[PDB]
Design an enzyme around this catalytic site. Structure first.
Site, PDB file in Angstrom:
ATOM      1  N   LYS A 122     -14.918  -5.858   2.735  1.00 20.34           N
ATOM      2  CA  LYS A 122     -16.168  -6.554   2.457  1.00 20.34           C
ATOM      3  C   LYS A 122     -16.135  -7.963   3.054  1.00 20.34           C
ATOM      4  CE  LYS A 122     -15.857  -2.904   0.067  1.00 20.34           C
ATOM      5  NZ  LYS A 122     -16.265  -1.669   0.779  1.00 20.34           N
ATOM      6  N   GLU A 144       1.787  -3.980   0.780  1.00 19.54           N
ATOM      7  CA  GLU A 144       2.611  -2.833   1.147  1.00 19.54           C
ATOM      8  C   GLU A 144       1.693  -1.948   2.031  1.00 19.54           C
ATOM      9  OE1 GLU A 144       3.470  -0.545  -2.424  1.00 19.54           O
ATOM     10  OE2 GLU A 144       4.206   1.196  -1.295  1.00 19.54           O
ATOM     11  N   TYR A 145       2.191  -1.449   3.162  1.00 25.60           N
ATOM     12  CA  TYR A 145       1.475  -0.536   4.029  1.00 25.60           C
ATOM     13  C   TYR A 145       1.532   0.874   3.373  1.00 25.60           C
ATOM     14  CZ  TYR A 145       1.305   2.646   8.209  1.00 25.60           C
ATOM     15  OH  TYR A 145       1.029   3.604   9.146  1.00 25.60           O
ATOM     16  N   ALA A 146       0.365   1.537   3.193  1.00 29.73           N
ATOM     17  CA  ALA A 146       0.272   2.917   2.665  1.00 29.73           C
ATOM     18  C   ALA A 146       0.096   3.813   3.882  1.00 29.73           C
ATOM     19  CB  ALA A 146      -0.916   3.064   1.726  1.00 29.73           C
ATOM     20  N   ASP A 172     -12.615  -1.155 -10.071  1.00 32.21           N
ATOM     21  CA  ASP A 172     -13.134  -0.705  -8.779  1.00 32.21           C
ATOM     22  C   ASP A 172     -12.351   0.518  -8.313  1.00 32.21           C
ATOM     23  OD1 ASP A 172     -15.180  -1.122  -6.858  1.00 32.21           O
ATOM     24  OD2 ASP A 172     -13.847  -2.214  -5.504  1.00 32.21           O
ATOM     25  N   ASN A 209     -10.221   2.969  -2.384  1.00 30.89           N
ATOM     26  CA  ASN A 209      -9.222   2.048  -2.997  1.00 30.89           C
ATOM     27  C   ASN A 209      -7.966   2.735  -3.515  1.00 30.89           C
ATOM     28  OD1 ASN A 209     -11.811  -0.208  -4.333  1.00 30.89           O
ATOM     29  ND2 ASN A 209     -10.852  -0.054  -2.324  1.00 30.89           N
ATOM     30  N   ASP A 245      -6.620  -2.454  -3.902  1.00 30.15           N
ATOM     31  CA  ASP A 245      -7.842  -3.228  -3.983  1.00 30.15           C
ATOM     32  C   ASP A 245      -8.163  -3.736  -5.409  1.00 30.15           C
ATOM     33  OD1 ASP A 245     -10.066  -4.600  -3.406  1.00 30.15           O
ATOM     34  OD2 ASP A 245     -11.242  -2.919  -2.657  1.00 30.15           O
TER      35      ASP A 245
HETATM   36  N1  LIG Z   1      -1.984  -1.374   2.410  1.00 28.38           N
HETATM   37  C1  LIG Z   1      -2.859  -0.663   3.127  1.00 28.38           C
HETATM   38  N2  LIG Z   1      -2.397   0.336   3.922  1.00 28.38           N
HETATM   39  C2  LIG Z   1      -3.279   1.063   4.620  1.00 28.38           C
HETATM   40  N3  LIG Z   1      -4.612   0.942   4.668  1.00 28.38           N
HETATM   41  C3  LIG Z   1      -5.040  -0.054   3.880  1.00 28.38           C
HETATM   42  C4  LIG Z   1      -4.254  -0.876   3.082  1.00 28.38           C
HETATM   43  N4  LIG Z   1      -5.036  -1.769   2.369  1.00 28.38           N
HETATM   44  C5  LIG Z   1      -6.257  -1.501   2.772  1.00 28.38           C
HETATM   45  N5  LIG Z   1      -6.335  -0.478   3.683  1.00 28.38           N
HETATM   46  C6  LIG Z   1      -7.552   0.058   4.302  1.00 28.38           C
HETATM   47  O1  LIG Z   1      -8.522  -0.982   4.402  1.00 28.38           O
HETATM   48  C7  LIG Z   1      -9.648  -0.695   3.545  1.00 28.38           C
HETATM   49  C8  LIG Z   1     -10.147  -1.965   2.894  1.00 28.38           C
HETATM   50  O2  LIG Z   1      -9.113  -2.521   2.036  1.00 28.38           O
HETATM   51  P1  LIG Z   1      -9.360  -3.106   0.594  1.00 28.38           P
HETATM   52  O3  LIG Z   1      -8.202  -3.822  -0.022  1.00 28.38           O
HETATM   53  O4  LIG Z   1      -9.923  -2.024  -0.297  1.00 28.38           O
HETATM   54  O5  LIG Z   1     -10.514  -4.163   0.902  1.00 28.38           O
HETATM   55  P2  LIG Z   1     -11.878  -4.518   0.158  1.00 28.38           P
HETATM   56  O6  LIG Z   1     -11.640  -5.287  -1.103  1.00 28.38           O
HETATM   57  O7  LIG Z   1     -12.620  -5.302   1.154  1.00 28.38           O
HETATM   58  O8  LIG Z   1     -12.626  -3.209  -0.170  1.00 28.38           O
HETATM   59  C9  LIG Z   1      -9.132   0.375   2.590  1.00 28.38           C
HETATM   60  O9  LIG Z   1     -10.173   1.109   1.967  1.00 28.38           O
HETATM   61  C10 LIG Z   1      -8.204   1.182   3.496  1.00 28.38           C
HETATM   62  O10 LIG Z   1      -8.966   2.023   4.362  1.00 28.38           O
HETATM   63  O1  LIG Z   2     -10.529  -8.996  -1.795  1.00 23.66           O
HETATM   64  C1  LIG Z   2     -11.709  -9.170  -1.541  1.00 23.66           C
HETATM   65  O2  LIG Z   2     -12.241  -8.926  -0.380  1.00 23.66           O
HETATM   66  C2  LIG Z   2     -12.705  -9.828  -2.471  1.00 23.66           C
HETATM   67  C3  LIG Z   2     -12.163 -11.071  -3.178  1.00 23.66           C
HETATM   68  C4  LIG Z   2     -13.273 -11.778  -3.961  1.00 23.66           C
HETATM   69  C5  LIG Z   2     -14.009 -10.835  -4.926  1.00 23.66           C
HETATM   70  C6  LIG Z   2     -14.479  -9.556  -4.236  1.00 23.66           C
HETATM   71  C7  LIG Z   2     -13.316  -8.877  -3.513  1.00 23.66           C
HETATM   72  C8  LIG Z   2     -13.571  -7.482  -3.006  1.00 23.66           C
HETATM   73  O3  LIG Z   2     -12.511  -6.747  -3.180  1.00 23.66           O
HETATM   74  O4  LIG Z   2     -14.634  -7.076  -2.551  1.00 23.66           O
HETATM   75 MG   LIG Z   3     -12.122  -4.877  -2.932  1.00 24.80          MG
HETATM   76 MG   LIG Z   4     -11.772  -1.546  -1.138  1.00 27.76          MG
END
Ligand SMILES: Nc1ncnc2c1ncn2[C@@H]1O[C@H](COP(=O)(O)OP(=O)(O)O)[C@@H](O)[C@H]1O
Ligand SMILES: O=C(O)[C@@H]1CCCC[C@H]1C(=O)O
Ligand SMILES: [Mg+2]
Ligand SMILES: [Mg+2]
Ligand SMILES: Cc1c(C(=O)NS(=O)(=O)C2CC2)cc(-c2ccc(Cl)cc2)c2cc[nH]c12
EC number: 2.7.11.1
Length: 258
Positions: free
Chosen positions: A18, A86-88, A131, A136, A149
């Site tokens: 986001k 951590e990388y998934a 969430d 996530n 997330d």
């Molecule tokens: N540690 C990770 N390893 C692999 N893919 C990841 C990892 N963290 C995030 N991602 C990818 O990036 C996307 C966005 O990460 P996320 O932490 O959920 O961000 P946001 O808060 O913006 O939704 C995830 O839905 C996944 O596709």
């Molecule tokens: O990690 C983030 O991108 C953001 C941090 C601030 C609140 C909203 C949050 C999200 O996960 O959408």
């Molecule tokens: Mg998020």
């Molecule tokens: Mg997310």
């Protein structure tokens, strides 16, 4: 603060967020492969979400569970905030569901157990994730589920995309506790078995009404034990939602969980 961008080699984007993007990265001295969640300061400031983020960091950094994605640290520069994760390696549960259309009962039950255990540990620290959704939920090297997330995570009790995973109390802007994650668990169990969340609609307004009413039906292939657990979790009344201990001991979970 000890870490800086110069300490990492950056690889391909792993996914979009986001407030930025997540990249694969390698720490130069140790060759440690990890994920860098990059967030733009201007966008966070514009949204006024700087305090939430400080909280995503604070909450996630203190969690230690095999089914919870680790947050190792953070750093920032003039334009960006960087979360060291951590990388998934096996990606999101979201992508697996798109590929497979729906999961069988054994894959569903296993994921629900892994999630219930991670959520039990969270709720023990009064941490509400809020969430819980397939994008996530990431997959480790053995295909084990990892809750990720923590962007909207809070300490219980509290106040604050689609509404698909949000319970009625959050949708109305009312006070909420750990029971919000029990509702999300019911939405996920249905989505894993059916391929779509139970309140899915064309508009936000139609989804809101379906959630408020707890208005959903099951396709015929959903078994009796699966219907029982889902129906128990999707209670308008948060108090009615079962404890996670009960979810793990549920006959359909114990019979299909691997
Ligand atoms: N540690 C990770 N390893 C692999 N893919 C990841 C990892 N963290 C995030 N991602 C990818 O990036 C996307 C966005 O990460 P996320 O932490 O959920 O961000 P946001 O808060 O913006 O939704 C995830 O839905 C996944 O596709
Ligand atoms: O990690 C983030 O991108 C953001 C941090 C601030 C609140 C909203 C949050 C999200 O996960 O959408
Ligand atoms: Mg998020
Ligand atoms: Mg997310
Ligand atoms: C402006 C600024 C600063 C900040 O203090 N920056 S500074 O060092 O004073 C300046 C030279 C850059 C810090 C943050 C921030 C960092 C880590 C977390 Cl986890 C959460 C928030 C944010 C977020 C949006 N804007 C921010």
């Amino acid at each position: 603060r000890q870490w800086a961008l110069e300490d990492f080699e950056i690889g391909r984007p792993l996914g979009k967020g986001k407030f930025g993007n997540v990249y694969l990265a390698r720490e130069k001295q140790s060759k440690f492969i990890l994920a860098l969640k990059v967030l733009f300061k201007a966008q966070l400031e514009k949204a006024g979400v700087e305090h939430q983020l400080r909280r995503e960091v604070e909450i996630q950094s203190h969690l230690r569970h095999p089914n919870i994605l680790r947050l190792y640290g953070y750093f920032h520069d003039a334009t960006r905030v960087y979360l060291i994760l951590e990388y998934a390696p096996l990606g999101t549960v979201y992508r697996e569901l798109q590929k497979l259309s729906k999961f069988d009962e054994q894959r569903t039950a296993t994921y629900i157990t892994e999630l219930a255990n991670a959520l039990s540990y969270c709720h023990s620290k009064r941490v509400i994730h809020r969430d819980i959704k397939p994008e996530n939920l990431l997959l480790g090297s053995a295909g084990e589920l990892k809750i990720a997330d923590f962007g909207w995570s809070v300490h219980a009790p509290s106040s604050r995309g689609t509404l698909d995973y949000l319970p009625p109390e959050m949708i109305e802007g009312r006070m909420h506790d750990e029971k919000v994650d029990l509702w999300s668990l019911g939405v996920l169990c249905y989505e894993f078995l059916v391929g779509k969340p139970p309140f899915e609609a064309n508009t936000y307004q139609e989804t809101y009404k379906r959630i408020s009413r707890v208005e959903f039906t099951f396709p015929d292939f959903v078994t009796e034990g699966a219907r029982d657990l889902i129906s128990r979790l999707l209670k308008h009344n948060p108090s009615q939602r079962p404890m996670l201990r009960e979810v793990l001991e549920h006959p359909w979970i114990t019979a299909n969980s691997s």
